[PDB]
Amino acid sequence: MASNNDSIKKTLFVVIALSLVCSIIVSAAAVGLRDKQKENAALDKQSKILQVAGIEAKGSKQIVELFNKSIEPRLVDFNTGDFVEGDAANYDQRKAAKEASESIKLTAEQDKAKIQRRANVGVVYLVKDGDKTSKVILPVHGNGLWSMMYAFVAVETDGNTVSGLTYYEQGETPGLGGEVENPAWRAQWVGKKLFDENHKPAIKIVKGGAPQGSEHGVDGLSGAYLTSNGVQNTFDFWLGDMGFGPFLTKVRDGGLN
Amino acid sequence: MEHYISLLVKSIFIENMALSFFLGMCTFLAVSKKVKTSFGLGIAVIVVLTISVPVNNLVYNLVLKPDALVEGVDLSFLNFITFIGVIAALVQILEMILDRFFPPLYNALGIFLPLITVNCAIFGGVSFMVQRDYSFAESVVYGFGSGVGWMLAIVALAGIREKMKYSDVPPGLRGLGITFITAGLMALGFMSFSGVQL
Amino acid sequence: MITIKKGLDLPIAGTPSQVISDGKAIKKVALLGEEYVGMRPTMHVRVGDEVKKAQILFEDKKNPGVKFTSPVSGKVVEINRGAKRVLQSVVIEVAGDDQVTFDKFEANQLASLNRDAIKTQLVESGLWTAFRTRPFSKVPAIDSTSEAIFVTAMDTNPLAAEPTVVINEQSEAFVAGLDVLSALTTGKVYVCKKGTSLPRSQQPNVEEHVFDGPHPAGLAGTHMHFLYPVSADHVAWSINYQDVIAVGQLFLTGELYTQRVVSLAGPVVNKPRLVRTVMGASLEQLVDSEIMPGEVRIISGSVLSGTKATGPHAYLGRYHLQVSVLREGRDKELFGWAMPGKNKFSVTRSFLGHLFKGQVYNMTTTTNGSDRSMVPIGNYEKVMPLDMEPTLLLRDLCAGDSDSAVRLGALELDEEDLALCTFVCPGKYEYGQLLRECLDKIEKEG
Amino acid sequence: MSTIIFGVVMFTLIILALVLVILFAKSKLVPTGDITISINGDPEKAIVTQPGGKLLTALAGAGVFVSSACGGGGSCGQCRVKIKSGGGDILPTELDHISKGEAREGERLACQVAVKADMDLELPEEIFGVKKWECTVISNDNKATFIKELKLAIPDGESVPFRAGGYIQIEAPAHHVKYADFDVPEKYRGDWDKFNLFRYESKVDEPIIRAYSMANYPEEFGIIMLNVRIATPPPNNPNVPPGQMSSYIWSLKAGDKCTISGPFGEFFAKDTDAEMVFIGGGAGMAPMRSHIFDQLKRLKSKRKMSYWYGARSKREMFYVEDFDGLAAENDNFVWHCALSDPQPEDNWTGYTGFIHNVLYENYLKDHEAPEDCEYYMCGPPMMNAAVINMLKNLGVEEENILLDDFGG
Amino acid sequence: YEAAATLFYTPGLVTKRSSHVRDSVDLKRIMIMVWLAVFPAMFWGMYNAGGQAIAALNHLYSGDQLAAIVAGNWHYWLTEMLGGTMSSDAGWGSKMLLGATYFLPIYATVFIVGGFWEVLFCMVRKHEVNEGFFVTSILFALIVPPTLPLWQAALGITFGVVVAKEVFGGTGRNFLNPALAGRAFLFFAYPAQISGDLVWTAADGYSGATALSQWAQGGAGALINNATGQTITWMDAFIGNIPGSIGEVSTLALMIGAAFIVYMGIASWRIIGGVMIGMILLSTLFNVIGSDTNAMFNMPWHWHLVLGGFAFGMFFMATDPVSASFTNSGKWAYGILIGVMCVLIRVVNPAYPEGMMLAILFANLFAPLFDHVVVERNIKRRLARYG
Amino acid sequence: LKKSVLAPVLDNNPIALQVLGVCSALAVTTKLETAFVMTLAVMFVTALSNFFVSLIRNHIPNSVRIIVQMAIIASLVIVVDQILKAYLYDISKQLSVFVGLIITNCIVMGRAEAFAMKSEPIPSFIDGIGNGLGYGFVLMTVGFFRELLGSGKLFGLEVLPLISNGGWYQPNGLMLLAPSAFFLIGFMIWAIRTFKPEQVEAKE
Ligand SMILES: Cc1cc2nc3c(=O)[nH]c(=O)nc-3n(C[C@H](O)[C@H](O)[C@H](O)COP(=O)(O)OP(=O)(O)OC[C@H]3O[C@@H](n4cnc5c(N)ncnc54)[C@H](O)[C@@H]3O)c2cc1C
Ligand SMILES: Cc1cc2nc3c(=O)[nH]c(=O)nc-3n(C[C@H](O)[C@H](O)[C@H](O)COP(=O)(O)O)c2cc1C
Ligand SMILES: Cc1cc2nc3c(=O)[nH]c(=O)nc-3n(C[C@H](O)[C@H](O)[C@H](O)CO)c2cc1C
Ligand code: FES
Ligand code: FES
Ligand SMILES: [Ca+2]
Numbered sequence A: 001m002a003s004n005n006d007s008i009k010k011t012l013f014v015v016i017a018l019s020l021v022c023s024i025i026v027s028a029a030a031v032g033l034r035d036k037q038k039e040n041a042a043l044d045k046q047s048k049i050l051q052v053a054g055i056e057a058k059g060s061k062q063i064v065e066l067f068n069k070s071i072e073p074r075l076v077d078f079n080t081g082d083f084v085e086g087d088a089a090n091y092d093q094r095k096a097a098k099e100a101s102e103s104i105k106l107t108a109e110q111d112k113a114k115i116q117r118r119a120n121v122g123v124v125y126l127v128k129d130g131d132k133t134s135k136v137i138l139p140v141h142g143n144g145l146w147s148m149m150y151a152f153v154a155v156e157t158d159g160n161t162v163s164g165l166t167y168y169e170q171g172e173t174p175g176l177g178g179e180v181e182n183p184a185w186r187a188q189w190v191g192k193k194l195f196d197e198n199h200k201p202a203i204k205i206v207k208g209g210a211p212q213g214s215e216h217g218v219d220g221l222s223g224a225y226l227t228s229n230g231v232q233n234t235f236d237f238w239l240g241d242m243g244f245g246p247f248l249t250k251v252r253d254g255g256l257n
Numbered sequence B: 001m002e003h004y005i006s007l008l009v010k011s012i013f014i015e016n017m018a019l020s021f022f023l024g025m026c027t028f029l030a031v032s033k034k035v036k037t038s039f040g041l042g043i044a045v046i047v048v049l050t051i052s053v054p055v056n057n058l059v060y061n062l063v064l065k066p067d068a069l070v071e072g073v074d075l076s077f078l079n080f081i082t083f084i085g086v087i088a089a090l091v092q093i094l095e096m097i098l099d100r101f102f103p104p105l106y107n108a109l110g111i112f113l114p115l116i117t118v119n120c121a122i123f124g125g126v127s128f129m130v131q132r133d134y135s136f137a138e139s140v141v142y143g144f145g146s147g148v149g150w151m152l153a154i155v156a157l158a159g160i161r162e163k164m165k166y167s168d169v170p171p172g173l174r175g176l177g178i179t180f181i182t183a184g185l186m187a188l189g190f191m192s193f194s195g196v197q198l
Numbered sequence C: 001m002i003t004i005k006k007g008l009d010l011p012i013a014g015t016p017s018q019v020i021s022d023g024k025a026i027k028k029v030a031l032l033g034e035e036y037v038g039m040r041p042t043m044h045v046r047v048g049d050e051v052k053k054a055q056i057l058f059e060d061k062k063n064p065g066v067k068f069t070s071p072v073s074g075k076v077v078e079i080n081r082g083a084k085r086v087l088q089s090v091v092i093e094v095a096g097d098d099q100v101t102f103d104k105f106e107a108n109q110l111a112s113l114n115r116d117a118i119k120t121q122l123v124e125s126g127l128w129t130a131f132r133t134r135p136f137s138k139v140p141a142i143d144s145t146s147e148a149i150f151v152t153a154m155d156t157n158p159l160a161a162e163p164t165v166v167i168n169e170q171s172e173a174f175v176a177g178l179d180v181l182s183a184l185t186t187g188k189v190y191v192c193k194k195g196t197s198l199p200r201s202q203q204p205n206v207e208e209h210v211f212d213g214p215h216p217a218g219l220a221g222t223h224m225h226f227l228y229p230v231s232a233d234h235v236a237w238s239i240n241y242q243d244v245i246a247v248g249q250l251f252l253t254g255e256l257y258t259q260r261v262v263s264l265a266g267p268v269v270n271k272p273r274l275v276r277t278v279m280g281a282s283l284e285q286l287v288d289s290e291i292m293p294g295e296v297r298i299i300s301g302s303v304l305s306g307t308k309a310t311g312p313h314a315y316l317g318r319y320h321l322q323v324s325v326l327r328e329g330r331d332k333e334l335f336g337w338a339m340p341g342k343n344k345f346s347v348t349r350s351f352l353g354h355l356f357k358g359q360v361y362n363m364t365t366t367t368n369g370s371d372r373s374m375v376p377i378g379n380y381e382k383v384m385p386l387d388m389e390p391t392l393l394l395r396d397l398c399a400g401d402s403d404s405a406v407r408l409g410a411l412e413l414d415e416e417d418l419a420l421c422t423f424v425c426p427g428k429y430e431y432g433q434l435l436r437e438c439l440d441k442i443e444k445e446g
Numbered sequence D: 001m002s003t004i005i006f007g008v009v010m011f012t013l014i015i016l017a018l019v020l021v022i023l024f025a026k027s028k029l030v031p032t033g034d035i036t037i038s039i040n041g042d043p044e045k046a047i048v049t050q051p052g053g054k055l056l057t058a059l060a061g062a063g064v065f066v067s068s069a070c071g072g073g074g075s076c077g078q079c080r081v082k083i084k085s086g087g088g089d090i091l092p093t094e095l096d097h098i099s100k101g102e103a104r105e106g107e108r109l110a111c112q113v114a115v116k117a118d119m120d121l122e123l124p125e126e127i128f129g130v131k132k133w134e135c136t137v138i139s140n141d142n143k144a145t146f147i148k149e150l151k152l153a154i155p156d157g158e159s160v161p162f163r164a165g166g167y168i169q170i171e172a173p174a175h176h177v178k179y180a181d182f183d184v185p186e187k188y189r190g191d192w193d194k195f196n197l198f199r200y201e202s203k204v205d206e207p208i209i210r211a212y213s214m215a216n217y218p219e220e221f222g223i224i225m226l227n228v229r230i231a232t233p234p235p236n237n238p239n240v241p242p243g244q245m246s247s248y249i250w251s252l253k254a255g256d257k258c259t260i261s262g263p264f265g266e267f268f269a270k271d272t273d274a275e276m277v278f279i280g281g282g283a284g285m286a287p288m289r290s291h292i293f294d295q296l297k298r299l300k301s302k303r304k305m306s307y308w309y310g311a312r313s314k315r316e317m318f319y320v321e322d323f324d325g326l327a328a329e330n331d332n333f334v335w336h337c338a339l340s341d342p343q344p345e346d347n348w349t350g351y352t353g354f355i356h357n358v359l360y361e362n363y364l365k366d367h368e369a370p371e372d373c374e375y376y377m378c379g380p381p382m383m384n385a386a387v388i389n390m391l392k393n394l395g396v397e398e399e400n401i402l403l404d405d406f407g408g
Numbered sequence E: 001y002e003a004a005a006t007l008f009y010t011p012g013l014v015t016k017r018s019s020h021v022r023d024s025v026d027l028k029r030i031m032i033m034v035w036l037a038v039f040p041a042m043f044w045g046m047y048n049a050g051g052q053a054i055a056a057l058n059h060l061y062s063g064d065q066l067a068a069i070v071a072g073n074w075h076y077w078l079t080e081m082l083g084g085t086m087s088s089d090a091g092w093g094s095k096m097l098l099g100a101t102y103f104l105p106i107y108a109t110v111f112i113v114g115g116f117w118e119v120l121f122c123m124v125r126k127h128e129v130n131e132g133f134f135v136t137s138i139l140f141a142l143i144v145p146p147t148l149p150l151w152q153a154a155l156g157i158t159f160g161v162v163v164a165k166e167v168f169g170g171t172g173r174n175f176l177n178p179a180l181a182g183r184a185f186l187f188f189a190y191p192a193q194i195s196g197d198l199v200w201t202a203a204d205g206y207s208g209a210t211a212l213s214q215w216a217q218g219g220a221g222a223l224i225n226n227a228t229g230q231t232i233t234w235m236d237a238f239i240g241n242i243p244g245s246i247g248e249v250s251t252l253a254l255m256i257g258a259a260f261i262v263y264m265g266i267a268s269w270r271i272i273g274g275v276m277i278g279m280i281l282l283s284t285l286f287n288v289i290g291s292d293t294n295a296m297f298n299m300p301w302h303w304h305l306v307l308g309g310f311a312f313g314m315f316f317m318a319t320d321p322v323s324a325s326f327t328n329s330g331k332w333a334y335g336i337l338i339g340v341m342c343v344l345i346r347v348v349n350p351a352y353p354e355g356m357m358l359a360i361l362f363a364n365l366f367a368p369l370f371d372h373v374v375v376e377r378n379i380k381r382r383l384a385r386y387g
Numbered sequence F: 001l002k003k004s005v006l007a008p009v010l011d012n013n014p015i016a017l018q019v020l021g022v023c024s025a026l027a028v029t030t031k032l033e034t035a036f037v038m039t040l041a042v043m044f045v046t047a048l049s050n051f052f053v054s055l056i057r058n059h060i061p062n063s064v065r066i067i068v069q070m071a072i073i074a075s076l077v078i079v080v081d082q083i084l085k086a087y088l089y090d091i092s093k094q095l096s097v098f099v100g101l102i103i104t105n106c107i108v109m110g111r112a113e114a115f116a117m118k119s120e121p122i123p124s125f126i127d128g129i130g131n132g133l134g135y136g137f138v139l140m141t142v143g144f145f146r147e148l149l150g151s152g153k154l155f156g157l158e159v160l161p162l163i164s165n166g167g168w169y170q171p172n173g174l175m176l177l178a179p180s181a182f183f184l185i186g187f188m189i190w191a192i193r194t195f196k197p198e199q200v201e202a203k204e
Helices: A010-034 A033-055 A060-070 A093-098 A183-187 A228-240 A245-255 B002-014 B024-028 B034-064 B076-101 B105-112 B120-132 B134-165 B175-193 C107-112 C114-127 C164-169 C171-184 C218-226 C241-253 C390-399 C402-408 C417-425 C431-445 D002-029 D053-063 D098-106 D189-195 D244-251 D282-299 D320-329 D355-364 D379-396 E003-010 E027-036 E039-059 E066-071 E073-082 E092-124 E133-142 E150-164 E178-189 E210-219 E234-239 E250-264 E270-291 E299-305 E310-317 E326-346 E357-362 E367-383 F020-029 F032-055 F065-087 F087-105 F108-117 F123-151 F179-192
Strands: A070-074 A122-129 A133-144 A148-153 A166-170 A204-207 A217-221 C016-022 C026-033 C042-043 C056-060 C067-069 C073-082 C087-094 C130-132 C148-152 C188-193 C206-212 C234-242 C259-265 C275-279 C296-301 C306-308 C320-328 D134-139 D142-144 D147-154 D167-172 D177-179 D201-204 D210-214 D223-229 D259-264 D274-280 D305-311 D332-340 D374-378 D400-404
Touching: A010 A033, A010 B076, A010 C067, A010 F065, A033 A060, A033 A148, A033 A166, A033 C016, A033 E250, A033 F065, A060 A070, A070 F032, A093 C241, A133 A228, A148 E250, A166 B134, A204 A228, A204 B076, A228 C130, B002 B134, B002 D147, B024 B105, B024 B175, B024 E310, B024 F020, B034 B105, B034 B120, B034 B134, B034 D002, B076 B120, B076 D002, B076 F065, B076 F087, B105 F108, B120 B134, B120 F087, B134 B175, B134 C390, B134 E367, B175 E178, B175 E357, B175 F179, C016 C164, C042 C087, C042 E150, C056 C087, C067 C114, C067 F087, C087 E092, C107 C171, C107 C241, C114 C171, C114 C241, C130 C218, C148 C171, C148 C241, C164 C171, C164 C241, C171 C188, C171 C206, C171 C241, C188 C218, C188 F108, C206 C218, C218 C234, C218 C417, C234 C241, C259 C296, C275 D053, C275 F123, C390 C402, C390 C417, C390 C431, C402 E367, C402 F108, C417 C431, D002 F065, D053 D134, D134 E039, D142 D244, D167 D244, D177 D244, D201 D244, D210 D282, D210 E027, D223 D244, D223 D282, D274 D282, D274 D355, D282 D305, D305 D355, D320 D332, D332 D355, D332 E299, D374 D379, E027 E133, E027 E250, E039 E066, E039 E092, E039 E133, E066 E073, E073 E092, E092 E133, E092 E150, E133 E310, E150 E178, E178 E357, E234 E250, E234 E299, E234 F065, E250 E270, E250 E310, E270 E299, E270 E310, E310 E326, E310 E357, E326 E357, E326 E367, E326 F065, F020 F087, F020 F123, F032 F087, F032 F108, F032 F123, F065 F108, F108 F123, F123 F179
Parallel strands: A204 A217, C016 C275, C148 C188, C148 C234, C188 C206, C259 C320, D274 D305, D274 D374, D305 D332, D374 D400
Antiparallel strands: A070 A122, A122 A133, A133 A148, A148 A166, C026 C087, C042 C056, C056 C067, C073 C087, C130 C234, C259 C275, C296 C306, C296 C320, D134 D147, D134 D259, D142 D147, D147 D223, D167 D210, D167 D259, D177 D201
């Protein structure tokens, strides 16, 4: 082959040089920008929390100052629903759950699959109007058809009425599962009661659409079975005894204050 | 055993690479003219996927997984480049083998032989393996099943196109356009497994 | 003993009386150029030439050494040519009894003659054109040989004659022809017959095989499929019983034997029967005053596979042993496609006709519908007894895929093998032409 | 920093391992030894080369190779070779020019064949006859408006072994030519002046090769007579660039050095007793003259034959004396000429119109057996189509139709 | 007007070559015979739709409310105007008339639009308009709910005729079922109008599931007719006194119609037998395995037969000659695959309660592959000189 | 020269004539925003990879050419994704699920093999830009119909008011599934070869 490119020495030299190049570049790009990427992710989470709480904000400065002004992170024990002392502002529930110090759920109570472990302490965001509490935001998540889906729920301190819901991290196929992020679909969750008179979970994702005024039903996602099902299972779990059940009971009895 | 049989059936039918997830469509549409050419191409794809998925499983779990080598260093940013390098080496060897021993297939594929590297189905399979965190045996079974499903899809399309020797397609649609429409109809047919969970 | 279960005996009206009688005197005979596959003639006569019996009329360019000779002594009166000056027929007006004479041997010597001597005598007499080759149904090349020669001593075509009646009248000639064929072959000779007795040769390489069932149980293609599967590497020859009698007569008396016994039958023939005629006779003069009034079609051969004998073609054929006559069905009826169908035939049970067993039909030449695409309701499988995929093969022929058709078994077939498939097609396709086109392509391209 | 060095090192090591595996695999799947291709069954004059590359290049290096001008594949199928061993199966492209029966016998295209293993060829005896190329121009005078006759004298009177109707491969170097260099008598300059086309010129970047047929029959030893048609842009498309080699050869003059290849080609007559019918137009006069002279003078054939030539006007016709003498001295030869549209200066009396119609109306309309004789043919493509259609309608078979299809 | 003449009269042609005598059958007779075989199913479907609607209306409303509801629907007040009654004591005539006012507009729309497309394509390609579209249109009209909007019907028939058949060259040239292709287009484009609990009885404001959906929830004990309070029985499902698509309900009527075209030799008893074998095998396997949380595991074969569109599909849609396998051996496999897929989608797929059209469209993709396997075996036999 | 950059739009389209970008065309064409972003990304990556491969085309051994090309392409894609995540987080969020699909987009490697290995740097860059434009033409045309008919929106702006919001339009659910993309591309090819009939395939 021309210009002795077939020589073993030439081949090895070419490949090693072209690896050193593009390796330096990829590594430098990946490691230099990590902090900026994490900052952007955190700012996006704050923006999503504000949006679900119902506060208009634009720009990093406005978002951060409003979040500091209006939202008060807090920790809960799940098992007892009691508020737990701690920072509550730098707590990483994902890391906590991955740590071996936390619980592991057997199939019987693992309603929402592929979540093997649950943290013993969760974080909730209390909306403030004045000095007392107007709402509470609950982070919930569950496995979908493709990956893990995370969302916020914004109950109104009575323990039943939803008042808002957003998905701040999901990777479902656009058009079918990605519609979980549709504003029109998100609008259906306003006013749903989330509990029946016996205080059992009662939120339903109805296949084929829910009758008007159902007061517990939310339309499923067209052509999106198993992801409507994941959305059902996540709530079935997180409203149960293993999730925010006891905490929502203590909120319902007026203990939120 | 039922675990692996369930995984294999899932990969072949419920998550068919071609007619579900619609991956690896370029060569699937281009090289569907003859059943036996499609059969050979599918065998090659099966071999490449079966070898690629386990090797990439090992590489990721041993050097690229967080804290795999030493604590605090994460090399996951090299996932794509490492995976594609492995696949490229495999296709490079496949080229020599086909040239030596299967000259008819080598000539039939033509331009698309080196393009098996960038067949979206293989890279998608490796990525799905990494996301789902399969073990080594599960990786082997998953790669084999995905390859078998892709081969089944392409062979079925080739059979349809051969049956269409009796058709009267308009000149404008002859070839690529009618093949596109046929593939769409096949997708409609394959929507039967939407909602079944293995 | 081989039994064919899939087939069809067409219940057309007017079946012949199996008794031989003298026919109308014939004054003109002809040789039809288009009848022979792949023939490109070279004329050796011109209008106004006097000829003798067995004198050469023309020769084939594409098959050197093969001679086509005159059946009678007389004068050439027409050399008909059609589109692109394609030879249609050479017409001779009978007169005199001059003839060319060849060598004659005794009966006991025929089985041990030299193959080259046999071949030269046949070629010179012009009786070499009785043979045909599967594949391609062409006259064999004079320098070739074959391991299998198939004799057809049965006939299952509708309205066909009874070979037993004809053969029993010429037993010595039939046996002598069988002996000559046994000497001429390099393998076996297959005498295909029905269950009844025939004169038989004492040579050990001549064998009798019995076939039972409906049409096409009596076709050389069927016999070959079951006894000697043919292909590009295995080539068989076929010849009918009357030609075997002619061969025996030639080698016994040194003279060309041109007499025939054909069946004149059909729905419009007053007295169907077998009649003695001569090779290439004029069908117009043969059926003179034998037919009912009206517009009719005269066919050389069976209705399944014959030649419309009009104008320069009538003029009986070389390989045909019967003449069929039936009305021309140009009628146009209202809602005819929707009638119950008491008097309508079909291999489908969608008419009332099939409920009356033993009913014969005065069939006409109507095409009971228009040309349409193929919707395979499974009619072909009912009438094809060979081990093939008929619907797939027919779609291959329609699409023009010669290689695929060859793989599927086109080389084993003749136009007469697809006659029933053409007959029962709801789309009114004609598969003889498609098969011939495919075979021409295969022969030319390689 | 500790996580950049790790990444660089790990990626480079992985790539190096993969490349080493590839090299090891190549060491076994790709042979490196010599091939030793045999150009014929004889145990001599064999060629030993390294593996890889197309077959044609090995023969080119050896110096003896089959005819080809385009040098490519999949178009014009102008290269052929016979192979008995090796060479693999027939590439699909080749089948577009190779019949299945030929493929069974082992015909192949040199361009498409790849040198992977030892193989033996069965090249004919003809291509070994390639000859030295030097030759001297004697004259390049004009004979028709757009045609000139070029005469070449071979050194030492060498008798090039060419058959009637063959052609030679001619070569030219890079050059720049202007039409003003061309010289023509006063007779033909009217057409030139009509367009004032002397402005045309062309450039040849690198040497080019073309093929031409000799106008002399074998008995004319030591001389190569040639007929060349000038490739000029279409009258309706003056902007079209002109032809290179036609202009270059027209540039030559008497006494100039010239280069030709060995004798090659096809379109030879056959050895039957059938009548012959030579029909040609324009540039096709050379093969017809070669055939006619060979048959009448060398072979002294008694078979009947005739020649039919079509021309635009009386000014376009030549060799009239040769053909008239042939007809007068031979009773078996008759020649006729048809003018498409004679001009006033012609004062023409006789057959007019297209040659195919003239021939059909005068000879083939009454012929006893049109299909029996043989039709040798050479002319412009549309005349070729017309005469082929006429003959086919008359019922002549392809085997009796022989022609050279270079389209003047 | 030459359109009527070429449909009423016979061509009056003769034979030019080959066989000088031809069989009496032709494509026109085949298609018209298939067209007539669904008439009992169509008539019973109209009658049943009317009966279901009237029963539901009188279960929901009464008196002045019923009068107001009637006055607000053109179907209802046209039925009353033409002499019928919408009272609970309505007769078979009133029920059939009410069903007709639903079926006939759908059929007319489908026929006109599909005919427009067929005529356009045939004119452009200079062919003769042929039958088969009759079968396509009538089947498509019969396999939809009684409440399907007319514009949706038009879109569905357009898709089925054009995309699935005409671009391939027309009748006999395609590989997919056109009617089921149109139905699938509707099913995936506008699910709310061809699925659920508000579609299968043409009663205003009425909601009710049908047998296949109720067996998913409970067992055979969950099959109850809410309009009348009775329990659906096997005989009710067999005769056709149940809601659903217009022409699918009566298994008895479908069997009567299909016996004729099977006897005549137009439909493939091999395909029908394959479908039956596959269904029986898979349903009995599920019964043997059993399940604690899925009630569909204990549904027997004789119940699978009479529910949903299984009988309609098996008899009239799985037997399309063009879309099926062309070999006798391939027909058995084709039918078995269709039956297996139908039962499988019914049982282990919770998204869909029925799977007949999806199963047929799935098997249409693999029929040529079965043909290929069989023909390759035949070719090997040939190369062996048949031993 | 614009004649060089505009040819692949209709004369040599990477999808309508070549079969090189089908998967992403089926995937990312439910919104014009994602279609536009993917078009830009593919154009940029193909141009740069063609340039870099052509720079060193004379030193690449035939036995590792695929490895070299894929290394360059993957490095470019990874760096681009990192930069988008760092500075254009909003856009990166849309393209995150399809980042990997860019590496195996057959257009990039097909043009590197077919053109860059034979041509010079600037011509290769122009060829990459032209093929990106041709790819974007099909992507945008399909996305127009899909988005408009499946949601009544163009670039997220309401155009056909939906019934769920008091409108009159009922969205088509099949426009959110791949078969709609298959059919749309088929009919696009039909129109493109009805005009410019030189591209019609032979036989039949
Ligand atoms: C074996 C063989 C033998 C032949 N022998 C003879 C012979 O003896 N006598 C004879 O007269 N001819 C003969 N020919 C035919 C032909 O005259 C020669 O091939 C001649 O050498 C070709 O002319 P050229 O190479 O000078 O023109 P080229 O430079 O090859 O040009 C070919 C033509 O294309 C045109 N052209 C170029 N570019 C364009 C463009 N962009 N658009 C449109 N048109 C364009 C040119 O103007 C010219 O008309 C023979 C051909 C063959 C194959
Ligand atoms: C031929 C045919 C095929 C059908 N295919 C399907 C199908 O694939 N999926 C579906 O959900 N319904 C399909 N249906 C509709 C159902 O058979 C039936 O009309 C509907 O399910 C009635 O309500 P039920 O499911 O409660 O019984 C089909 C109907 C027919 C006639
Ligand atoms: C027995 C039989 C069944 C048919 N079934 C169908 C059918 O289910 N759908 C349809 O569109 N056409 C049907 N047709 C008509 C025709 O065969 C079909 O449209 C072809 O696929 C057209 O090429 C049927 C025809 C026959 C004879
Ligand atoms: S295989 Fe070509 S882009 Fe997916
Ligand atoms: S055309 Fe010259 S080598 Fe093929
Ligand atoms: Ca947790």
